[PDB]
């Protein structure tokens with residue numbers, strides 16, 4: 001169970017724009033979660049080899065992580081905020097699907113998700 005390639009973070013064919021909602025997602029939302037004490041397991045793709053999780057990529061077919069999200073934001077990969085929000089949701093859902101409801105990693109993801117929802121509650125209107 002080698003790891004898959006990471007999710008793409010740039011694509012020369014995918015259209016680009018800089019907007020204030022995407023800026024908010026990078027500067028406020030991602031920033032807040034990134035620097036949180038629970039961020040670190042989520043700051044890069046799950047390395048199922050180093051973590052000895054041979055079934056991870058049998059269960060999780062749409063991996064996602066904040067490192068990927070950060071690069072996507074930095075690279076103007078997203079056209080709109082919803083695309084980015086979807087990736088955060090994917091990351092949290094994967095964690096909840098793969099792990100058991102007691103688990104420390106799940107509590108960590110719940111805390112980040114609560115914070116995520118607070119910051120997305122205040123997304124600015126598009127200029």
Ligand SMILES: Cc1noc(C)c1-c1cc(O)cc(CN2CCC(F)(F)CC2)c1
Nearest residue numbers: 040041042046053094095098099104105
């Ligand atoms: C995210 C994610 N989703 O599913 C898995 C499995 C991971 C995961 C990713 C990591 O980079 C490291 C660990 C180990 N874990 C960290 C927190 C802890 F609470 F300390 C327990 C050990 C788990």
